[PDB]
Each structure stands twice: as structure tokens, then as C-alpha cells.
Amino acid sequence: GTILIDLSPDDKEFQSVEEEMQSTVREHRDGGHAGGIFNRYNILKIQKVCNKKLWERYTHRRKEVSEENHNHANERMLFHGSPFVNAIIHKGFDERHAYIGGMFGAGIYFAENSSKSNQYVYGIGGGTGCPVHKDRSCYICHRQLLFCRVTLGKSFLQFSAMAHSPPGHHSVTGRPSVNGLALAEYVIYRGEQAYPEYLITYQIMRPE
Ligand SMILES: NS(=O)(=O)c1ccc(-c2nc3ccccc3c(=O)[nH]2)cc1
Ligand SMILES: [Zn+2]
């Protein structure tokens, strides 16, 4: 049921998605080990992901959450990187897209920093890097990330350095407590609480 619509680089919507991608790059504490060394990306393509069933699944859950939280879905646009990106855009997020070993338990993880999600494009810890060159810092191979609509509802705040949400909550927020430059990361425990809105195809760029 999924259709991918190419956005033109001239479209304001392409431009605002690219800007969120580029402007949320940060340095990582692994010095690039997982995701590679780069300060910015070469954006190759941005596509809108269109699936009626998946959208209605999302909006249905969004209303349930909203009604449990004074009519406030607390909806964000967040990045997601995964070896399962192609399955996600066709079948939606589910229990198989969960990070079992994540620090906030077995859930589906999202980041404000695009560079954080980039660490997972090739698997946990960057796996063994790109399939062609086995390089976690490959500047040649095409990578994909999702920029997703995520319903957080009432989010449990964790101050830090599939399972269930904490009772009385719809998600968990991992607030950075050491690295002053890190943005928040978020976890949901229901696949229906995220919709993979944009598929972004890119390369990381070697710093000069
Ligand atoms: N199914 S799996 O290959 O085990 C898997 C998929 C996605 C991720 C992932 N973990 C994150 C953790 C913090 C912030 C953002 C992310 C992210 O974008 N993806 C982890 C594992
Ligand atoms: Zn490569």
C-alpha cells in the first residue's frame, strides 16, 4: 500500500526537512566510531511516504493518547535510523523494530539529533558498517533515515548520561545529563505511535 513521492529540491517541504537534518548534526562521544566522521550530509533524495492504512493506524492511536492527556498528543518530528527502514515504510513500525537492549528498555527509539539516528543505519553501534566496503564511516555508500511523526503523549522524563510504558505514561524521554550539546532521545512502546513521514537518502561528507 505504500507509495513514495519525490520532493523537488525547490519545494519548501524539501528545504525544511533538509534543514532539520543538517542543523541537528552534533559530535558523538565515540569520536565517530558508530556513525562515521562528518559535520554535515549530502542530501540525495527526500521522499514522502504515503500509506493510507498506516496513516489511519497512527491517527487512531494519536486520538486515544490525546484523549488520555487533556487533548494533547504531544506530537514531535523525530529521526529514526534502522537496518529495517525498507520494512518500516511498507509495513509500519512494530515489535521487530524495537531496540531490545536500549537504555530505556525494549522499545522503538527516536532522536532529535539526526546524527544519533545515523549511528543505527547499519545496525546497533553501526554494525560492521556499509555492506559494500564494511566501513562505518563510508563516504560513498547511500544511507537512508526516516523523519517521523511521533506521538509522545505524557512522557516519563529520565535524566541520564516490547516493554510497556511506565504506568500513567505514553512514552519515555531520555534527557541528556552530561553532554551539554546532546539533544533528547525518545522511546515509544507501541508501533502505532509513529508514522514514517519522510524517507531521506544521503551520504555523510568527509570534513575538509
Ligand atoms: N531493530 S534494531 O536493529 O535492533 C534497532 C533499530 C533502530 C535502533 C535505533 N536506536 C536509537 C537509539 C537512540 C536514538 C535513536 C535511535 C534510532 O534512530 N534507532 C536501534 C536498534
Ligand atoms: Zn561503502
JSON list of C-alpha atoms and ligand atoms in Angstrom, two decimals:
[
{"chain": "A", "resi": 1, "resn": "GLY", "atom": "CA", "xyz": [0.00, 0.00, 0.00]},
{"chain": "A", "resi": 2, "resn": "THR", "atom": "CA", "xyz": [2.98, 2.36, 0.24]},
{"chain": "A", "resi": 3, "resn": "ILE", "atom": "CA", "xyz": [3.71, 4.97, -2.42]},
{"chain": "A", "resi": 4, "resn": "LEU", "atom": "CA", "xyz": [6.88, 7.14, -2.35]},
{"chain": "A", "resi": 5, "resn": "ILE", "atom": "CA", "xyz": [6.55, 10.69, -3.72]},
{"chain": "A", "resi": 6, "resn": "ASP", "atom": "CA", "xyz": [9.75, 12.54, -4.61]},
{"chain": "A", "resi": 7, "resn": "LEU", "atom": "CA", "xyz": [10.05, 16.04, -3.34]},
{"chain": "A", "resi": 8, "resn": "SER", "atom": "CA", "xyz": [11.70, 18.59, -5.53]},
{"chain": "A", "resi": 9, "resn": "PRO", "atom": "CA", "xyz": [14.71, 20.41, -4.04]},
{"chain": "A", "resi": 10, "resn": "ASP", "atom": "CA", "xyz": [12.73, 23.58, -4.87]},
{"chain": "A", "resi": 11, "resn": "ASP", "atom": "CA", "xyz": [9.82, 22.56, -2.60]},
{"chain": "A", "resi": 12, "resn": "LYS", "atom": "CA", "xyz": [9.69, 24.37, 0.75]},
{"chain": "A", "resi": 13, "resn": "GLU", "atom": "CA", "xyz": [8.91, 20.99, 2.29]},
{"chain": "A", "resi": 14, "resn": "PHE", "atom": "CA", "xyz": [12.19, 19.50, 0.93]},
{"chain": "A", "resi": 15, "resn": "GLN", "atom": "CA", "xyz": [14.03, 22.54, 2.22]},
{"chain": "A", "resi": 16, "resn": "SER", "atom": "CA", "xyz": [12.58, 22.42, 5.78]},
{"chain": "A", "resi": 17, "resn": "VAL", "atom": "CA", "xyz": [13.29, 18.66, 6.11]},
{"chain": "A", "resi": 18, "resn": "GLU", "atom": "CA", "xyz": [16.87, 19.11, 4.82]},
{"chain": "A", "resi": 19, "resn": "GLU", "atom": "CA", "xyz": [17.42, 21.93, 7.30]},
{"chain": "A", "resi": 20, "resn": "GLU", "atom": "CA", "xyz": [16.29, 19.79, 10.25]},
{"chain": "A", "resi": 21, "resn": "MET", "atom": "CA", "xyz": [18.60, 17.02, 9.05]},
{"chain": "A", "resi": 22, "resn": "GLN", "atom": "CA", "xyz": [21.69, 19.27, 8.67]},
{"chain": "A", "resi": 23, "resn": "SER", "atom": "CA", "xyz": [21.15, 21.55, 11.66]},
{"chain": "A", "resi": 24, "resn": "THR", "atom": "CA", "xyz": [20.84, 18.64, 14.18]},
{"chain": "A", "resi": 25, "resn": "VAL", "atom": "CA", "xyz": [24.20, 17.07, 13.43]},
{"chain": "A", "resi": 26, "resn": "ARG", "atom": "CA", "xyz": [26.46, 17.03, 16.55]},
{"chain": "A", "resi": 27, "resn": "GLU", "atom": "CA", "xyz": [29.73, 15.37, 17.58]},
{"chain": "A", "resi": 28, "resn": "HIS", "atom": "CA", "xyz": [29.39, 11.96, 19.30]},
{"chain": "A", "resi": 29, "resn": "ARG", "atom": "CA", "xyz": [31.27, 10.62, 22.32]},
{"chain": "A", "resi": 30, "resn": "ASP", "atom": "CA", "xyz": [32.60, 7.66, 20.26]},
{"chain": "A", "resi": 31, "resn": "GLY", "atom": "CA", "xyz": [34.60, 10.09, 18.05]},
{"chain": "A", "resi": 32, "resn": "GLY", "atom": "CA", "xyz": [32.68, 8.74, 15.03]},
{"chain": "A", "resi": 33, "resn": "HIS", "atom": "CA", "xyz": [33.09, 5.02, 15.67]},
{"chain": "A", "resi": 34, "resn": "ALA", "atom": "CA", "xyz": [29.41, 4.06, 15.15]},
{"chain": "A", "resi": 35, "resn": "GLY", "atom": "CA", "xyz": [28.22, 6.56, 12.54]},
{"chain": "A", "resi": 36, "resn": "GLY", "atom": "CA", "xyz": [31.36, 7.94, 10.91]},
{"chain": "A", "resi": 37, "resn": "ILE", "atom": "CA", "xyz": [33.18, 11.25, 10.98]},
{"chain": "A", "resi": 38, "resn": "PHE", "atom": "CA", "xyz": [31.23, 14.17, 9.45]},
{"chain": "A", "resi": 39, "resn": "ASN", "atom": "CA", "xyz": [29.78, 17.60, 10.22]},
{"chain": "A", "resi": 40, "resn": "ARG", "atom": "CA", "xyz": [27.14, 17.52, 7.54]},
{"chain": "A", "resi": 41, "resn": "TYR", "atom": "CA", "xyz": [25.41, 15.50, 4.85]},
{"chain": "A", "resi": 42, "resn": "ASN", "atom": "CA", "xyz": [24.99, 15.36, 1.09]},
{"chain": "A", "resi": 43, "resn": "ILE", "atom": "CA", "xyz": [21.20, 15.00, 0.71]},
{"chain": "A", "resi": 44, "resn": "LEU", "atom": "CA", "xyz": [20.46, 12.94, -2.38]},
{"chain": "A", "resi": 45, "resn": "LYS", "atom": "CA", "xyz": [16.68, 12.47, -2.16]},
{"chain": "A", "resi": 46, "resn": "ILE", "atom": "CA", "xyz": [13.72, 13.22, 0.09]},
{"chain": "A", "resi": 47, "resn": "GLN", "atom": "CA", "xyz": [10.52, 11.23, -0.46]},
{"chain": "A", "resi": 48, "resn": "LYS", "atom": "CA", "xyz": [7.10, 11.49, 1.24]},
{"chain": "A", "resi": 49, "resn": "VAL", "atom": "CA", "xyz": [5.87, 8.12, 2.45]},
{"chain": "A", "resi": 50, "resn": "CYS", "atom": "CA", "xyz": [2.17, 7.67, 1.66]},
{"chain": "A", "resi": 51, "resn": "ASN", "atom": "CA", "xyz": [0.24, 4.75, 3.09]},
{"chain": "A", "resi": 52, "resn": "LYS", "atom": "CA", "xyz": [-3.44, 5.18, 3.95]},
{"chain": "A", "resi": 53, "resn": "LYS", "atom": "CA", "xyz": [-3.70, 2.22, 6.30]},
{"chain": "A", "resi": 54, "resn": "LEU", "atom": "CA", "xyz": [-0.54, 3.10, 8.20]},
{"chain": "A", "resi": 55, "resn": "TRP", "atom": "CA", "xyz": [-1.66, 6.76, 8.49]},
{"chain": "A", "resi": 56, "resn": "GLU", "atom": "CA", "xyz": [-5.07, 5.82, 9.86]},
{"chain": "A", "resi": 57, "resn": "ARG", "atom": "CA", "xyz": [-3.44, 3.40, 12.30]},
{"chain": "A", "resi": 58, "resn": "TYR", "atom": "CA", "xyz": [-1.30, 6.35, 13.54]},
{"chain": "A", "resi": 59, "resn": "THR", "atom": "CA", "xyz": [-4.16, 8.90, 13.76]},
{"chain": "A", "resi": 60, "resn": "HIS", "atom": "CA", "xyz": [-6.36, 6.38, 15.60]},
{"chain": "A", "resi": 61, "resn": "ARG", "atom": "CA", "xyz": [-3.73, 5.88, 18.30]},
{"chain": "A", "resi": 62, "resn": "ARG", "atom": "CA", "xyz": [-2.97, 9.61, 18.34]},
{"chain": "A", "resi": 63, "resn": "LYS", "atom": "CA", "xyz": [-6.61, 10.39, 19.28]},
{"chain": "A", "resi": 64, "resn": "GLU", "atom": "CA", "xyz": [-6.57, 7.73, 22.01]},
{"chain": "A", "resi": 65, "resn": "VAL", "atom": "CA", "xyz": [-3.42, 9.29, 23.52]},
{"chain": "A", "resi": 66, "resn": "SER", "atom": "CA", "xyz": [-4.76, 12.86, 23.13]},
{"chain": "A", "resi": 67, "resn": "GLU", "atom": "CA", "xyz": [-7.96, 11.92, 24.95]},
{"chain": "A", "resi": 68, "resn": "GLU", "atom": "CA", "xyz": [-5.88, 10.44, 27.81]},
{"chain": "A", "resi": 69, "resn": "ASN", "atom": "CA", "xyz": [-3.78, 13.65, 28.05]},
{"chain": "A", "resi": 70, "resn": "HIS", "atom": "CA", "xyz": [-6.07, 16.72, 28.05]},
{"chain": "A", "resi": 71, "resn": "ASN", "atom": "CA", "xyz": [-6.40, 16.70, 24.27]},
{"chain": "A", "resi": 72, "resn": "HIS", "atom": "CA", "xyz": [-2.62, 16.89, 23.75]},
{"chain": "A", "resi": 73, "resn": "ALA", "atom": "CA", "xyz": [-0.91, 14.30, 21.57]},
{"chain": "A", "resi": 74, "resn": "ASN", "atom": "CA", "xyz": [2.46, 15.97, 22.23]},
{"chain": "A", "resi": 75, "resn": "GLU", "atom": "CA", "xyz": [3.43, 15.22, 18.68]},
{"chain": "A", "resi": 76, "resn": "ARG", "atom": "CA", "xyz": [7.05, 15.66, 17.51]},
{"chain": "A", "resi": 77, "resn": "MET", "atom": "CA", "xyz": [9.03, 15.15, 14.27]},
{"chain": "A", "resi": 78, "resn": "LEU", "atom": "CA", "xyz": [11.95, 12.90, 15.12]},
{"chain": "A", "resi": 79, "resn": "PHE", "atom": "CA", "xyz": [14.66, 10.92, 13.31]},
{"chain": "A", "resi": 80, "resn": "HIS", "atom": "CA", "xyz": [14.87, 7.14, 13.14]},
{"chain": "A", "resi": 81, "resn": "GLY", "atom": "CA", "xyz": [17.74, 5.04, 11.72]},
{"chain": "A", "resi": 82, "resn": "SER", "atom": "CA", "xyz": [17.42, 1.28, 11.32]},
{"chain": "A", "resi": 83, "resn": "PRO", "atom": "CA", "xyz": [18.58, -1.64, 9.23]},
{"chain": "A", "resi": 84, "resn": "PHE", "atom": "CA", "xyz": [14.78, -2.26, 8.80]},
{"chain": "A", "resi": 85, "resn": "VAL", "atom": "CA", "xyz": [13.95, 1.11, 7.12]},
{"chain": "A", "resi": 86, "resn": "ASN", "atom": "CA", "xyz": [12.55, -0.63, 3.99]},
{"chain": "A", "resi": 87, "resn": "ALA", "atom": "CA", "xyz": [10.27, -2.86, 6.09]},
{"chain": "A", "resi": 88, "resn": "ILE", "atom": "CA", "xyz": [9.11, 0.14, 8.15]},
{"chain": "A", "resi": 89, "resn": "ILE", "atom": "CA", "xyz": [7.99, 2.18, 5.18]},
{"chain": "A", "resi": 90, "resn": "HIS", "atom": "CA", "xyz": [5.92, -0.77, 3.82]},
{"chain": "A", "resi": 91, "resn": "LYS", "atom": "CA", "xyz": [4.58, -2.44, 6.98]},
{"chain": "A", "resi": 92, "resn": "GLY", "atom": "CA", "xyz": [4.78, 0.26, 9.72]},
{"chain": "A", "resi": 93, "resn": "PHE", "atom": "CA", "xyz": [6.73, 0.15, 12.99]},
{"chain": "A", "resi": 94, "resn": "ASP", "atom": "CA", "xyz": [6.29, -2.95, 15.07]},
{"chain": "A", "resi": 95, "resn": "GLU", "atom": "CA", "xyz": [7.81, -5.00, 17.90]},
{"chain": "A", "resi": 96, "resn": "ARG", "atom": "CA", "xyz": [10.59, -6.13, 15.47]},
{"chain": "A", "resi": 97, "resn": "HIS", "atom": "CA", "xyz": [11.82, -2.56, 15.06]},
{"chain": "A", "resi": 98, "resn": "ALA", "atom": "CA", "xyz": [12.42, -2.30, 18.86]},
{"chain": "A", "resi": 99, "resn": "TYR", "atom": "CA", "xyz": [15.86, -1.85, 20.37]},
{"chain": "A", "resi": 100, "resn": "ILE", "atom": "CA", "xyz": [15.77, -4.73, 22.88]},
{"chain": "A", "resi": 101, "resn": "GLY", "atom": "CA", "xyz": [18.95, -3.58, 24.61]},
{"chain": "A", "resi": 102, "resn": "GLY", "atom": "CA", "xyz": [18.10, 0.12, 24.74]},
{"chain": "A", "resi": 103, "resn": "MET", "atom": "CA", "xyz": [18.76, 2.06, 27.93]},
{"chain": "A", "resi": 104, "resn": "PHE", "atom": "CA", "xyz": [15.09, 2.77, 28.46]},
{"chain": "A", "resi": 105, "resn": "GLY", "atom": "CA", "xyz": [14.01, -0.81, 27.78]},
{"chain": "A", "resi": 106, "resn": "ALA", "atom": "CA", "xyz": [12.72, -2.69, 24.76]},
{"chain": "A", "resi": 107, "resn": "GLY", "atom": "CA", "xyz": [11.04, 0.00, 22.68]},
{"chain": "A", "resi": 108, "resn": "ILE", "atom": "CA", "xyz": [11.28, 1.95, 19.44]},
{"chain": "A", "resi": 109, "resn": "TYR", "atom": "CA", "xyz": [13.82, 4.76, 19.77]},
{"chain": "A", "resi": 110, "resn": "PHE", "atom": "CA", "xyz": [13.84, 8.21, 18.09]},
{"chain": "A", "resi": 111, "resn": "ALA", "atom": "CA", "xyz": [16.31, 11.13, 18.19]},
{"chain": "A", "resi": 112, "resn": "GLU", "atom": "CA", "xyz": [16.26, 14.94, 17.87]},
{"chain": "A", "resi": 113, "resn": "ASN", "atom": "CA", "xyz": [19.83, 14.71, 16.55]},
{"chain": "A", "resi": 114, "resn": "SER", "atom": "CA", "xyz": [19.89, 13.26, 13.03]},
{"chain": "A", "resi": 115, "resn": "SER", "atom": "CA", "xyz": [23.49, 12.18, 13.71]},
{"chain": "A", "resi": 116, "resn": "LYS", "atom": "CA", "xyz": [22.31, 10.00, 16.63]},
{"chain": "A", "resi": 117, "resn": "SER", "atom": "CA", "xyz": [19.89, 8.05, 14.34]},
{"chain": "A", "resi": 118, "resn": "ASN", "atom": "CA", "xyz": [22.70, 7.85, 11.73]},
{"chain": "A", "resi": 119, "resn": "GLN", "atom": "CA", "xyz": [24.61, 5.62, 14.21]},
{"chain": "A", "resi": 120, "resn": "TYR", "atom": "CA", "xyz": [21.96, 2.92, 13.65]},
{"chain": "A", "resi": 121, "resn": "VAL", "atom": "CA", "xyz": [21.58, 2.90, 9.83]},
{"chain": "A", "resi": 122, "resn": "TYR", "atom": "CA", "xyz": [23.94, -0.12, 9.71]},
{"chain": "A", "resi": 123, "resn": "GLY", "atom": "CA", "xyz": [22.74, -1.70, 12.98]},
{"chain": "A", "resi": 124, "resn": "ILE", "atom": "CA", "xyz": [23.45, -1.23, 16.71]},
{"chain": "A", "resi": 125, "resn": "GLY", "atom": "CA", "xyz": [26.80, 0.53, 17.14]},
{"chain": "A", "resi": 126, "resn": "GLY", "atom": "CA", "xyz": [26.98, 0.89, 13.36]},
{"chain": "A", "resi": 127, "resn": "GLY", "atom": "CA", "xyz": [27.23, -2.91, 12.98]},
{"chain": "A", "resi": 128, "resn": "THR", "atom": "CA", "xyz": [30.01, -3.70, 10.55]},
{"chain": "A", "resi": 129, "resn": "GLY", "atom": "CA", "xyz": [29.39, -0.58, 8.50]},
{"chain": "A", "resi": 130, "resn": "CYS", "atom": "CA", "xyz": [28.23, -0.38, 4.90]},
{"chain": "A", "resi": 131, "resn": "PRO", "atom": "CA", "xyz": [27.56, -3.70, 3.16]},
{"chain": "A", "resi": 132, "resn": "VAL", "atom": "CA", "xyz": [29.89, -2.92, 0.20]},
{"chain": "A", "resi": 133, "resn": "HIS", "atom": "CA", "xyz": [33.04, -1.64, 1.97]},
{"chain": "A", "resi": 134, "resn": "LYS", "atom": "CA", "xyz": [32.45, -2.70, 5.64]},
{"chain": "A", "resi": 135, "resn": "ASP", "atom": "CA", "xyz": [33.11, 0.90, 6.68]},
{"chain": "A", "resi": 136, "resn": "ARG", "atom": "CA", "xyz": [31.02, 2.63, 9.38]},
{"chain": "A", "resi": 137, "resn": "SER", "atom": "CA", "xyz": [32.38, 5.91, 8.07]},
{"chain": "A", "resi": 138, "resn": "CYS", "atom": "CA", "xyz": [31.78, 5.18, 4.36]},
{"chain": "A", "resi": 139, "resn": "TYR", "atom": "CA", "xyz": [31.51, 8.41, 2.36]},
{"chain": "A", "resi": 140, "resn": "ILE", "atom": "CA", "xyz": [30.45, 6.61, -0.86]},
{"chain": "A", "resi": 141, "resn": "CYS", "atom": "CA", "xyz": [27.52, 4.36, 0.01]},
{"chain": "A", "resi": 142, "resn": "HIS", "atom": "CA", "xyz": [23.95, 5.74, 0.13]},
{"chain": "A", "resi": 143, "resn": "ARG", "atom": "CA", "xyz": [22.29, 5.77, 3.54]},
{"chain": "A", "resi": 144, "resn": "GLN", "atom": "CA", "xyz": [18.66, 6.22, 4.50]},
{"chain": "A", "resi": 145, "resn": "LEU", "atom": "CA", "xyz": [16.96, 7.75, 7.58]},
{"chain": "A", "resi": 146, "resn": "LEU", "atom": "CA", "xyz": [13.31, 8.34, 8.42]},
{"chain": "A", "resi": 147, "resn": "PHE", "atom": "CA", "xyz": [11.97, 11.67, 9.69]},
{"chain": "A", "resi": 148, "resn": "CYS", "atom": "CA", "xyz": [8.90, 10.57, 11.60]},
{"chain": "A", "resi": 149, "resn": "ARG", "atom": "CA", "xyz": [5.74, 11.90, 13.20]},
{"chain": "A", "resi": 150, "resn": "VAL", "atom": "CA", "xyz": [5.76, 10.57, 16.77]},
{"chain": "A", "resi": 151, "resn": "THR", "atom": "CA", "xyz": [3.08, 10.77, 19.46]},
{"chain": "A", "resi": 152, "resn": "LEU", "atom": "CA", "xyz": [4.69, 11.11, 22.91]},
{"chain": "A", "resi": 153, "resn": "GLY", "atom": "CA", "xyz": [1.62, 11.90, 24.97]},
{"chain": "A", "resi": 154, "resn": "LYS", "atom": "CA", "xyz": [2.56, 12.06, 28.67]},
{"chain": "A", "resi": 155, "resn": "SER", "atom": "CA", "xyz": [6.26, 11.25, 28.60]},
{"chain": "A", "resi": 156, "resn": "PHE", "atom": "CA", "xyz": [8.25, 9.87, 31.52]},
{"chain": "A", "resi": 157, "resn": "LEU", "atom": "CA", "xyz": [11.35, 12.07, 31.99]},
{"chain": "A", "resi": 158, "resn": "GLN", "atom": "CA", "xyz": [14.59, 10.20, 32.60]},
{"chain": "A", "resi": 159, "resn": "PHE", "atom": "CA", "xyz": [17.67, 12.29, 33.42]},
{"chain": "A", "resi": 160, "resn": "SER", "atom": "CA", "xyz": [20.56, 10.21, 32.07]},
{"chain": "A", "resi": 161, "resn": "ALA", "atom": "CA", "xyz": [24.19, 10.12, 30.94]},
{"chain": "A", "resi": 162, "resn": "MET", "atom": "CA", "xyz": [8.41, -4.90, 23.59]},
{"chain": "A", "resi": 163, "resn": "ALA", "atom": "CA", "xyz": [8.24, -3.40, 27.12]},
{"chain": "A", "resi": 164, "resn": "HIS", "atom": "CA", "xyz": [5.38, -1.26, 28.42]},
{"chain": "A", "resi": 165, "resn": "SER", "atom": "CA", "xyz": [5.35, 2.47, 29.02]},
{"chain": "A", "resi": 166, "resn": "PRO", "atom": "CA", "xyz": [5.79, 3.40, 32.64]},
{"chain": "A", "resi": 167, "resn": "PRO", "atom": "CA", "xyz": [2.32, 3.35, 34.28]},
{"chain": "A", "resi": 168, "resn": "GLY", "atom": "CA", "xyz": [0.45, 6.57, 33.61]},
{"chain": "A", "resi": 169, "resn": "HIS", "atom": "CA", "xyz": [2.73, 7.42, 30.62]},
{"chain": "A", "resi": 170, "resn": "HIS", "atom": "CA", "xyz": [2.74, 7.01, 26.80]},
{"chain": "A", "resi": 171, "resn": "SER", "atom": "CA", "xyz": [6.48, 7.30, 26.18]},
{"chain": "A", "resi": 172, "resn": "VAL", "atom": "CA", "xyz": [9.88, 7.90, 27.80]},
{"chain": "A", "resi": 173, "resn": "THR", "atom": "CA", "xyz": [12.15, 10.90, 27.26]},
{"chain": "A", "resi": 174, "resn": "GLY", "atom": "CA", "xyz": [15.88, 10.42, 27.70]},
{"chain": "A", "resi": 175, "resn": "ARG", "atom": "CA", "xyz": [17.15, 13.83, 28.79]},
{"chain": "A", "resi": 176, "resn": "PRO", "atom": "CA", "xyz": [20.88, 14.32, 28.27]},
{"chain": "A", "resi": 177, "resn": "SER", "atom": "CA", "xyz": [22.57, 14.91, 31.76]},
{"chain": "A", "resi": 178, "resn": "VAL", "atom": "CA", "xyz": [26.36, 15.04, 30.93]},
{"chain": "A", "resi": 179, "resn": "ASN", "atom": "CA", "xyz": [26.91, 16.08, 27.30]},
{"chain": "A", "resi": 180, "resn": "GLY", "atom": "CA", "xyz": [25.78, 19.67, 27.15]},
{"chain": "A", "resi": 181, "resn": "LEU", "atom": "CA", "xyz": [25.34, 19.58, 23.38]},
{"chain": "A", "resi": 182, "resn": "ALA", "atom": "CA", "xyz": [23.20, 16.42, 23.09]},
{"chain": "A", "resi": 183, "resn": "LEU", "atom": "CA", "xyz": [19.54, 16.69, 22.20]},
{"chain": "A", "resi": 184, "resn": "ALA", "atom": "CA", "xyz": [16.81, 14.44, 23.66]},
{"chain": "A", "resi": 185, "resn": "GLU", "atom": "CA", "xyz": [16.01, 10.87, 22.61]},
{"chain": "A", "resi": 186, "resn": "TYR", "atom": "CA", "xyz": [12.57, 9.31, 22.98]},
{"chain": "A", "resi": 187, "resn": "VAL", "atom": "CA", "xyz": [11.08, 5.84, 23.27]},
{"chain": "A", "resi": 188, "resn": "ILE", "atom": "CA", "xyz": [7.58, 4.56, 22.41]},
{"chain": "A", "resi": 189, "resn": "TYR", "atom": "CA", "xyz": [6.32, 1.08, 23.16]},
{"chain": "A", "resi": 190, "resn": "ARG", "atom": "CA", "xyz": [3.52, 0.90, 20.55]},
{"chain": "A", "resi": 191, "resn": "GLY", "atom": "CA", "xyz": [4.34, 0.82, 16.81]},
{"chain": "A", "resi": 192, "resn": "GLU", "atom": "CA", "xyz": [1.14, 2.72, 16.11]},
{"chain": "A", "resi": 193, "resn": "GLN", "atom": "CA", "xyz": [2.54, 5.80, 17.85]},
{"chain": "A", "resi": 194, "resn": "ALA", "atom": "CA", "xyz": [4.87, 6.73, 14.97]},
{"chain": "A", "resi": 195, "resn": "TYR", "atom": "CA", "xyz": [4.37, 7.30, 11.23]},
{"chain": "A", "resi": 196, "resn": "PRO", "atom": "CA", "xyz": [7.43, 7.24, 8.89]},
{"chain": "A", "resi": 197, "resn": "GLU", "atom": "CA", "xyz": [6.65, 10.52, 7.04]},
{"chain": "A", "resi": 198, "resn": "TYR", "atom": "CA", "xyz": [9.85, 11.13, 5.11]},
{"chain": "A", "resi": 199, "resn": "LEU", "atom": "CA", "xyz": [12.49, 8.81, 3.65]},
{"chain": "A", "resi": 200, "resn": "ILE", "atom": "CA", "xyz": [15.77, 10.68, 3.36]},
{"chain": "A", "resi": 201, "resn": "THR", "atom": "CA", "xyz": [18.57, 9.29, 1.18]},
{"chain": "A", "resi": 202, "resn": "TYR", "atom": "CA", "xyz": [22.03, 10.76, 1.86]},
{"chain": "A", "resi": 203, "resn": "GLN", "atom": "CA", "xyz": [25.73, 10.41, 2.21]},
{"chain": "A", "resi": 204, "resn": "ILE", "atom": "CA", "xyz": [27.83, 11.63, 5.15]},
{"chain": "A", "resi": 205, "resn": "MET", "atom": "CA", "xyz": [30.50, 14.12, 3.98]},
{"chain": "A", "resi": 206, "resn": "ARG", "atom": "CA", "xyz": [34.22, 13.90, 4.82]},
{"chain": "A", "resi": 207, "resn": "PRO", "atom": "CA", "xyz": [35.28, 17.03, 6.69]},
{"chain": "A", "resi": 208, "resn": "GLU", "atom": "CA", "xyz": [37.77, 19.21, 4.80]},
{"chain": "B", "resi": 1, "resn": "LIG", "atom": "N1", "xyz": [15.78, -3.21, 15.38]},
{"chain": "B", "resi": 1, "resn": "LIG", "atom": "S1", "xyz": [17.33, -2.92, 15.70]},
{"chain": "B", "resi": 1, "resn": "LIG", "atom": "O1", "xyz": [18.17, -3.25, 14.59]},
{"chain": "B", "resi": 1, "resn": "LIG", "atom": "O2", "xyz": [17.77, -3.74, 16.80]},
{"chain": "B", "resi": 1, "resn": "LIG", "atom": "C1", "xyz": [17.45, -1.30, 16.02]},
{"chain": "B", "resi": 1, "resn": "LIG", "atom": "C2", "xyz": [16.86, -0.35, 15.19]},
{"chain": "B", "resi": 1, "resn": "LIG", "atom": "C3", "xyz": [16.96, 1.03, 15.48]},
{"chain": "B", "resi": 1, "resn": "LIG", "atom": "C4", "xyz": [17.73, 1.49, 16.57]},
{"chain": "B", "resi": 1, "resn": "LIG", "atom": "C5", "xyz": [17.80, 2.95, 16.92]},
{"chain": "B", "resi": 1, "resn": "LIG", "atom": "N2", "xyz": [18.15, 3.28, 18.19]},
{"chain": "B", "resi": 1, "resn": "LIG", "atom": "C6", "xyz": [18.19, 4.56, 18.60]},
{"chain": "B", "resi": 1, "resn": "LIG", "atom": "C7", "xyz": [18.57, 4.90, 19.89]},
{"chain": "B", "resi": 1, "resn": "LIG", "atom": "C8", "xyz": [18.55, 6.24, 20.32]},
{"chain": "B", "resi": 1, "resn": "LIG", "atom": "C9", "xyz": [18.19, 7.26, 19.43]},
{"chain": "B", "resi": 1, "resn": "LIG", "atom": "C10", "xyz": [17.80, 6.95, 18.12]},
{"chain": "B", "resi": 1, "resn": "LIG", "atom": "C11", "xyz": [17.78, 5.63, 17.68]},
{"chain": "B", "resi": 1, "resn": "LIG", "atom": "C12", "xyz": [17.44, 5.19, 16.29]},
{"chain": "B", "resi": 1, "resn": "LIG", "atom": "O3", "xyz": [17.12, 6.01, 15.39]},
{"chain": "B", "resi": 1, "resn": "LIG", "atom": "N3", "xyz": [17.44, 3.89, 16.01]},
{"chain": "B", "resi": 1, "resn": "LIG", "atom": "C13", "xyz": [18.27, 0.52, 17.42]},
{"chain": "B", "resi": 1, "resn": "LIG", "atom": "C14", "xyz": [18.16, -0.84, 17.11]},
{"chain": "B", "resi": 2, "resn": "ZN", "atom": "ZN", "xyz": [30.50, 1.84, 1.44]}
]
